[PDB]
Amino acid sequence: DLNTLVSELPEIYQTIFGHPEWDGDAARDCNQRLDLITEQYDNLSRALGRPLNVLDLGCAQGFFSLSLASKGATIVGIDFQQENINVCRALAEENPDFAAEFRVGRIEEVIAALEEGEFDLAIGLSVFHHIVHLHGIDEVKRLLSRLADVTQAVILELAVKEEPFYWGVSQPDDPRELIEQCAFYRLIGEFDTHLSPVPRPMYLVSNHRVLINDFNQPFQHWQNQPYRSRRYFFGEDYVCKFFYYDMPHGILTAEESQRNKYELHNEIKFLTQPPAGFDAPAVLAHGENAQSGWLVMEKLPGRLLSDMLAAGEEIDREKILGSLLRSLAALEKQGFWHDDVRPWNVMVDARQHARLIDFGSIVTTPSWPTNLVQSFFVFVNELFFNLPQPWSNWLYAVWQEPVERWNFVLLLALFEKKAKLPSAEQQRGATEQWIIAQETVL
Amino acid sequence: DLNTLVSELPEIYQTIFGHPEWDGDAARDCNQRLDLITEQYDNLSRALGRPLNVLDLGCAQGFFSLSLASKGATIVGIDFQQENINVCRALAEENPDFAAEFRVGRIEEVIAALEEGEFDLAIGLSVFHHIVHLHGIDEVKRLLSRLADVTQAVILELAVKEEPFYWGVSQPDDPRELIEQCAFYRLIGEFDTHLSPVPRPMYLVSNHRVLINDFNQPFQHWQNQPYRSRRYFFGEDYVCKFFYYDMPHGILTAEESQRNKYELHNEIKFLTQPPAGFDAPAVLAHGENAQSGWLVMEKLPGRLLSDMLAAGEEIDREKILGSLLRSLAALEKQGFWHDDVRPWNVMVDARQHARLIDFGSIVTTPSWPTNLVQSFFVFVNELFFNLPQPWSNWLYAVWQEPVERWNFVLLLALFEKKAKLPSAEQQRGATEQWIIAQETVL
Ligand SMILES: C[S@@+](CC[C@H](N)C(=O)[O-])C[C@H]1O[C@@H](n2cnc3c(N)ncnc32)[C@H](O)[C@@H]1O
Ligand SMILES: C[S@@+](CC[C@H](N)C(=O)[O-])C[C@H]1O[C@@H](n2cnc3c(N)ncnc32)[C@H](O)[C@@H]1O
Ligand SMILES: Nc1ncnc2c1ncn2[C@@H]1O[C@H](COP(=O)(O)O)[C@@H](O)[C@H]1O
Ligand SMILES: Nc1ncnc2c1ncn2[C@@H]1O[C@H](COP(=O)(O)O)[C@@H](O)[C@H]1O
Ligand SMILES: [Cl-]
Ligand SMILES: [Cl-]
Ligand SMILES: [Cl-]
Numbered sequence: 001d002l003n004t005l006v007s008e009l010p011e012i013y014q015t016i017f018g019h020p021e022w023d024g025d026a027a028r029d030c031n032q033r034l035d036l037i038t039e040q041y042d043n044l045s046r047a048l049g050r051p052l053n054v055l056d057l058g059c060a061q062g063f064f065s066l067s068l069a070s071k072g073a074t075i076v077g078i079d080f081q082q083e084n085i086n087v088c089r090a091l092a093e094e095n096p097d098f099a100a101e102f103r104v105g106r107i108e109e110v111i112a113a114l115e116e117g118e119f120d121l122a123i124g125l126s127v128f129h130h131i132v133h134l135h136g137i138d139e140v141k142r143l144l145s146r147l148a149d150v151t152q153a154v155i156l157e158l159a160v161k162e163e164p165f166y167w168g169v170s171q172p173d174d175p176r177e178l179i180e181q182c183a184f185y186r187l188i189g190e191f192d193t194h195l196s197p198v199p200r201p202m203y204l205v206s207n208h209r210v211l212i213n214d215f216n217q218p219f220q221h222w223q224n225q226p227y228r229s230r231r232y233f234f235g236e237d238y239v240c241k242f243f244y245y246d247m248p249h250g251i252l253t254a255e256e257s258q259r260n261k262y263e264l265h266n267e268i269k270f271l272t273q274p275p276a277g278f279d280a281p282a283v284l285a286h287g288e289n290a291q292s293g294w295l296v297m298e299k300l301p302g303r304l305l306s307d308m309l310a311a312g313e314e315i316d317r318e319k320i321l322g323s324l325l326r327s328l329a330a331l332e333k334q335g336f337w338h339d340d341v342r343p344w345n346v347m348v349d350a351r352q353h354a355r356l357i358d359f360g361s362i363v364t365t366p367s368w369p370t371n372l373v374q375s376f377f378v379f380v381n382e383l384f385f386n387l388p389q390p391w392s393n394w395l396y397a398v399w400q401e402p403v404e405r406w407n408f409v410l411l412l413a414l415f416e417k418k419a420k421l422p423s424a425e426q427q428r429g430a431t432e433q434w435i436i437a438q439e440t441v442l
Numbered sequence: 443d444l445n446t447l448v449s450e451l452p453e454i455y456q457t458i459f460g461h462p463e464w465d466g467d468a469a470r471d472c473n474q475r476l477d478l479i480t481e482q483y484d485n486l487s488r489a490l491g492r493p494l495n496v497l498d499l500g501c502a503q504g505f506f507s508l509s510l511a512s513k514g515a516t517i518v519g520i521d522f523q524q525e526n527i528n529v530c531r532a533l534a535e536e537n538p539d540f541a542a543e544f545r546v547g548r549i550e551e552v553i554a555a556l557e558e559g560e561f562d563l564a565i566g567l568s569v570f571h572h573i574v575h576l577h578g579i580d581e582v583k584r585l586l587s588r589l590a591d592v593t594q595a596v597i598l599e600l601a602v603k604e605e606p607f608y609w610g611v612s613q614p615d616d617p618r619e620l621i622e623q624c625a626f627y628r629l630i631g632e633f634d635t636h637l638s639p640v641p642r643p644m645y646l647v648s649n650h651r652v653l654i655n656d657f658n659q660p661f662q663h664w665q666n667q668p669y670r671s672r673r674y675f676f677g678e679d680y681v682c683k684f685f686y687y688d689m690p691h692g693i694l695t696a697e698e699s700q701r702n703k704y705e706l707h708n709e710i711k712f713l714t715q716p717p718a719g720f721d722a723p724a725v726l727a728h729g730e731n732a733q734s735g736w737l738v739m740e741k742l743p744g745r746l747l748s749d750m751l752a753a754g755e756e757i758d759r760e761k762i763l764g765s766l767l768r769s770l771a772a773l774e775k776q777g778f779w780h781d782d783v784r785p786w787n788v789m790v791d792a793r794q795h796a797r798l799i800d801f802g803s804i805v806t807t808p809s810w811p812t813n814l815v816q817s818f819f820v821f822v823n824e825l826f827f828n829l830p831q832p833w834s835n836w837l838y839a840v841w842q843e844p845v846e847r848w849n850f851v852l853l854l855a856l857f858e859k860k861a862k863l864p865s866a867e868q869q870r871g872a873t874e875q876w877i878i879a880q881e882t883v884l
Contacts, residue, residue: 112584112623115663116591116649142554142584149558149591181554207558221557 002094005087009061017066017091027194030063033202036189037123037155040204040211041068044121044153047209047216052120055151057107058127062088062100069098076119077102078110107131111143116150126193126200128178129159133170141181148182148207157191157202164196174248175201183207183222184233184242187291210240215285215296227306227344229260238284239299241267246291263360264293270359271297275334278327281357300357301350306343309383317383319352321415327355328376329412331362337369337408338362341379373398373406377436385437389423392433396424399432444536447529451503459508459533469636472505475644478631479565479597482646482653483510486563486595489651489658494562497593499549500569504530504542511540518561519544520552549573553585558592568635568642570620571601575612583623590624590649599633599644606638616690617643625649625664626675626684629733652682657727657738669748669786671702680726681741683709688733705802706735712801713739717776720769723799742799743792748785751825759825761794763857769797770818771854773804779811779850780804783821815840815848819878827879831865834875838866841874 006016015030016022023029045052051072056065059077061084069075069092077100079085088102107127124147132140148154158175161168172178179185184206190199204211209218210233219233219240226232229247233240243264245257252260265288274280285296308315324346331337338345340361347357377395381387387395397414398406414421424433448458457472458464465471487494493514498507501519503526511517511534519542521527530544549569566589574582590596600617603610614620621627626648632641646653651660652675661675661682668674671689675682685706687699694702707730716722727738750757766788773779780787782803789799819837823829829837839856840848856863866875 112587115625117662139581139584142581142588145554146584146588146591149588183557220559 002087002090005083005090009083009087010081012061014061014063016061016087017063018094032189033125033157033191034064034067036202037064038067038071040153040155040188041071041073041121043213043216044211048120048152053118055110055114055119055122057110057122057124058130059088059102060084062091062102064123064125065100065102066091066095066098069095069100074099075101078105078107080104080106108135108139108143111146114146114150118150120152121155122147122151122153123155125155125157125202126159128156129167129171132172132178133167137172137177140178144178144205145181145207148205152206152208153211154182154205155188155202156205157200159193159200160198162198163193164198175203176248179203179205180248183219184210184231186211187246210235210242210296212240212285212287212294212296214287215240227304227310229256234299237299238296240285240294240296242292242294244292261288261293263358264288264295266362267359268293268295270336270362271295275331275336277330277334278336279355280359300347300355302347304344304357305346305348305354308348309343315348316352320346320348320354320383321380323353323355325408325412325415328408332369332408335364336362337372339372341372341376343379343382367403369408370403370406373408373411374436374439376408376411378440381436381440385433385440387433389425390418390421392424393421394418395432395436396427396429397421444529444532447525447532451525451529452523454503456503456505458503458529459505460536474631475567475599475633476506476509478644479506480509480513482595482597482630483513483515483563485655485658486653490562490594495560497552497556497561497564499552499564499566500572501530501544502526504533504544506565506567507542507544508533508537508540511537511542516541517543520547520549522546522548550577550581550585553588556588556592560592562594563597564589564593564595565597567597567599567644568601570598571609571613574614574620575609579614579619582620586620586647587623587649590647594648594650595653596624596647597630597644598647599642601635601642602640604640605635606640617645618690621645621647622690625661626652626673628653629688652677652684652738654682654727654729654736654738656729657682669746669752671698676741679741680738682727682736682738684734684736686734703730703735705800706730706737708804709801710735710737712778712804713737717773717778719772719776720778721797722801742789742797744789746786746799747788747790747796750790751785757790758794762788762790762796762825763822765795765797767850767854767857770850774811774850777806778804779814781814783814783818785821785824809845811850812845812848815850815853816878816881818850818853820882823878823882827875827882829875831867832860832863834866835863836860837874837878838869838871839863 006012006022011027012022012025013027015026041052054068054073054075056075056077059065059079062077065075065077077088082104085102085104092098092100108131128140158178159171160175161171161173182205186204187201188204189202191202192199209216217235219235222231222233224231229244229252231242233242243260245261268286271280271283281300282298283295284298287294328338338356338361345356345358346354348354394414398411401410448454448464453469454464454467455469457468483494496510496515496517498517498519501507501521504519507517507519519530524546527544527546534540534542550573570582600620601613602617603613603615624647628646629643630646631644633644634641651658659677661677664673664675666673671686671694673684675684685702687703710728713722713725723742724740725737726740729736770780780798780803787798787800788796790796836856840853843852
C-alpha cells in the first residue's frame with residue numbers, strides 16, 4: 001500500500017504526486033520549481049518538435065518525473081534510496097499510461113554510463129551538493145560537464161555556501177564554479193528551500209544549444225575570450241553574444257558590470273535602429289535582465305583583424321583602411337562615431353574589405369571628434385615609427401589641419417588622395433611621427 | 443635555429459620531422475606507430491569523406507602531428523614543455539602549407555575546454571600514465587570519456603604496470619580500466635618503447651562509431667549486459683555484436699573465452715551459410731582475431747522476449763510458441779538444432795511473431811534431440827505448475843510418446859492440434875508436471 005511506503009520514507013521531501021493528503025507533510029511543495037521546469041520542458045519540446053526523454057537525478061518521491069510524464073515525457077528517475085524508488089514505482093503504477101521508469105542507483109555511476117542522445121533534458125535539483133560534500137568540486141564539475149555533453153539541456157538547483165549548515169563549508173565559493181566550464185548557462189530562478197532564508201538558484205545549462213526563451217537553436221562552436229564575462233555562440237547563420245553583468249568572485253567591479261550592461265544595451269539600440277548609409281549586421285533576437293544580456297545577430301563572413309595580425313596572415317592595408325574609413329565617414333555624416341576602433345573590433349572578409357563588428361562603443365554626441373581621429377592614427381600604426389610613404393604623407397597632411405577641421409570625412413578624403421600629397425620626410429615634420437609612436441606605445 | 447632548439451630539448455623523444463640527422467638520437471623512431479595511425483586516419487577520413495581535424499595530446503616534437511598535416515590533416519598539438527613546442531613551431535615553419543598549430547598547455551585543461559565536433563581524431567600516445575601518476579585513475583577515466591565524447595575516434599598508446607619502473611606501481615592492473623567505460627574499443631597494435639622488453643598496447647576507442655577496418659559507421663546506442671565480455675552497438679539498419687575473447691582481470695576463464703570464441707564463430711558460420719527454409723538475419727560484416735570477434739547483422743524489429751516478460755508487457759504465448767516452433771521444426775528438417783532456447787535469445791515483433799536472434803548455440807549433429815525437447819518444456823513453463831489446458835494436454839501427449847520419437851517436428855505437430863488432445867487432468871499423469879516444475883526451478 002502507498003500509505004505504508006510513504007510512512008517508510010526517511011523523509012517526505014516532495015509532494016506525493018496525486019496524493020494531496022501528504023502535501024502538509026512535504027518539506028517542499030515543488031509547485032514553483034515545477035512551473036518553471038514545465039515552461040523549459042515546453043520550450044525545448046517545441047524546438048525539437050517532439051516529446052522529450054528526461055532524466056531525473058535524485059528523483060526522491062518522483063514528483064518532477066511523474067509531473068513531466070503526465071505531459072507526455074518519457075522519464076527515467078534515479079535515486080540511491082530504496083524507499084524513495086519504492087514510492088516512485090507505486091505512484092507510476094497508479095498512472096500506467098505514463099512512460100516512467102525508476103531505478104535505485106548512484107548519480108556518479110549513472111552519469112558515467114549515459115550515452116549521448118539517450119536523454120534530451122536532465123534535471124538535478126538539490127542533489128549535487130551531496131556529491132560535492134563526499135567527492136569534491138573537481139569531480140562534480142566533470143560529472144556536470146558529461147551530463148551537459150550527453151544531453152541537450154540541463155536544469156540544476158544548486159545549494160550554496162550561504163546556507164547556514166555545517167555542509168555549506170564544503171561548497172564552492174559560488175555555485176557557478178560547478179557549471180562555468182559548460183558552454184551555455186543562465187540563471188532562471190531562485191527558490192525557497194524551507195530550511196533557511198537563503199534561496200537556491202536554478203540554472204539552465206547546455207553544451208549544445210542556446211536556450212533563450214525567444215531563441216532556441218543548436219550551436220556548433222563557442223568562445224569565451226574574444227580574439228571572461230562575454231561568450232559568443234556560433235550557429236549556422238547566427239552569432240549569439242552573451243554578456244554576464246552578474247559574475248562570480250571578484251571578477252567584475254560595479255563599473256565593469258555596468259559597462260557590460262551599457263555596451264550591450266547600446267549595441268542593441270544601434271542595431272535595431274541603424275543609420276541609413278551604413279550596412280549593420282541584422283538582429284535576430286535580444287533581451288536583457290539583471291544577470292546578463294544577449295544579442296543574436298546574423299553571422300558575417302571573414303576573420304577578425306587582430307587574429308589575422310597575430311597569425312601573420314596576408315593583409316591588404318589599403319583595402320582594410322579604405323573600407324573602414326568609408327564606413328566611419330558615413331556614420332559621422334549621420335551623427336555617429338565609434339569610440340574604440342581596434343583590430344579586435346574589425347572583421348575582414350575574403351576580398352579584404354573591413355567592417356566594425358562591435359557597436360558597444362558607438363556614440364551620438366560630443367572639441368570633437370578630434371581624440372577619435374588621434375586614436376585612429378594609432379590603429380593605423382599598429383596595423384603596420386612604422387609608416388611608409390604615402391601613409392606618412394597622409395598623416396602629415398592631417399596634422400597640418402586646424403584642429404576644428406579634424407573629422408572622419410576629412411580623414412577619408414585625404415586618405416583617398418594620399419598618393420598626391422606632399423612628402424612628409426621633406427618637411428621638418430617631424431613630431432606627428434613621434435607623438436603617435438609614443439601613443440602607439442602608450 | 444633548429445639546431446639550438448633541438449639541443450635544448452630535455453629529451454629527443456621522437457624523430458625530428460624532416461631532419462634525419464637526429465634519427466639516431468631519437469628515443470623512439472615512431473615509424474611503426476605512424477604506419478598504424480596513418481591507416482586509421484585514412485579509414486576515418488574515407489568514412490567521413492574529408493580531411494580530418496586532429497588533436498595530438500603531449501605532442502612532444504611534433505612528429506605525428508606534422509606527419510598527418512603532411513597528408514592534409516588540420517592539426518593542433520599540445521605539450522606542457524615550452525622546449526618541445528618551440529621545436530614543433532620551428533618545424534611547422536619549415537612546412538608553411540601544413541595546417542598545424544601548437545600550444546603549450548596541460549592535457550587536463552585542454553580536455554575540459556574541448557567542444558564536440560572541433561576534432562574528429564585525438565591521439566594520446568604514452569602520455570596518460572603521467573596524468574595517472576599525478577591525479578589517479580578515476581580522474582583519467584573521466585578525462586578519456588570526455589575525449590571520446592567530443593571526438594569521433596581516439597587512439598591511445600598506454601603504458602602498463604609490467605614495465606619495470608617505480609611509476610608502474612601507480613598504474614591500474616590493466617590498461618583497459620582507463621577505457622572500458624568508453625563504448626567501443628579494440629586493440630590495434632603493441633609497440634616497443636626501448637625502455638624495456640614490455641611493449642605498450644595501442645587502442646582505438648570511440649563513443650560514436652564502430653571502427654572496424656571493413657565497417658565504419660556511426661551508432662546511436664549501445665549496450666553491454668544483454669537483457670560484460672559482449673557489447674552490442676545499434677545503428678540505423680544494423681546491430682554490431684562485439685565479443686571480447688581477451689578480457690582484463692579475472693573476468694573470463696580460459697573455457698569462457700573459448701566459448702565466446704566458439705559461439706561467435708559458430709554464429710558467423712551459420713549466418714553466412716544459412717539453411718534453406720529458415721529466414722536468418724543477414725550478415726553485413728564479420729571478422730575475428732586474438733582479442734575479439736565481431737559480427738554486423740541487419741537490425742530486426744521487435745523486443746527481446748525476456749525484457750517483455752520482465753517489464754510485464756502483454757504477450758500472446760500462442761503466437762510466440764507457434765512461430766518459434768515452426769522455425770525450430772524447419773531447422774530440424776535441415777539437420778539443425780538450437781541448444782539454448784531461452785527468453786533472452788528470442789525476439790518478438792509487433793505482430794507477436796517470434797524468432798531466434800542468437801545462433802551461437804546452433805548445432806548440426808547429436809539419444810537425441812530428446813534433451814532439447816525437455817528444456818523446451820521449461821522455456822514453455824517459464825513463458826508462463828503453471829500450464830493451463832490445452833498446453834498441459836500438449837505436454838502430456840508428448841510425454842506419452844516413446845522417446846526415440848521426441849523431436850521438433852513432433853512437438854510442432856502436437857502443438858498445432860493441442861485443442862483436440864485428451865485432457866491431462868483426467869489422467870493419472872501426473873509426473874510430467876512435477877519433473878518440469880522441478881526442472882523449471884532447476
Ligand atoms: C535534497 S533531495 C532533493 C530531491 C529532489 N531532486 C528535489 O529537489 O525535489 C536529494 C535527493 O537525492 C538523493 N541522492 C543524494 N545523493 C545521491 C546519489 N549520489 N545518487 C543518487 N541519489 C542521491 C537523496 O536520496 C534524495 O532523494
Ligand atoms: C613520453 S612522451 C610521449 C610523446 C609522444 N606523445 C609520443 O608518444 O611520441 C610524453 C609527452 O607528454 C608531455 N606531457 C606529459 N604530461 C603532460 C600534460 N599533463 N600536459 C601536456 N603535456 C604533457 C611531455 O612533455 C612529453 O612530451
Ligand atoms: N556577426 C558576426 N559574424 C561573425 N562573427 C562574429 C560576429 N560577431 C562577432 N563575431 C566573432 O566573435 C569572435 C570574438 O568576439 P568579438 O569580440 O565579437 O569579435 C570573433 O572571432 C568575431 O569574428
Ligand atoms: N539483429 C538484431 N536486430 C535487433 N536487435 C538485436 C539483433 N541482435 C541482437 N539484438 C538485440 O541485442 C540486445 C541484447 O543482445 P542479445 O543478447 O543479442 O539480445 C537485445 O535487446 C536484442 O534485441
Ligand atoms: Cl545542489
Ligand atoms: Cl574525477
Ligand atoms: Cl600512457
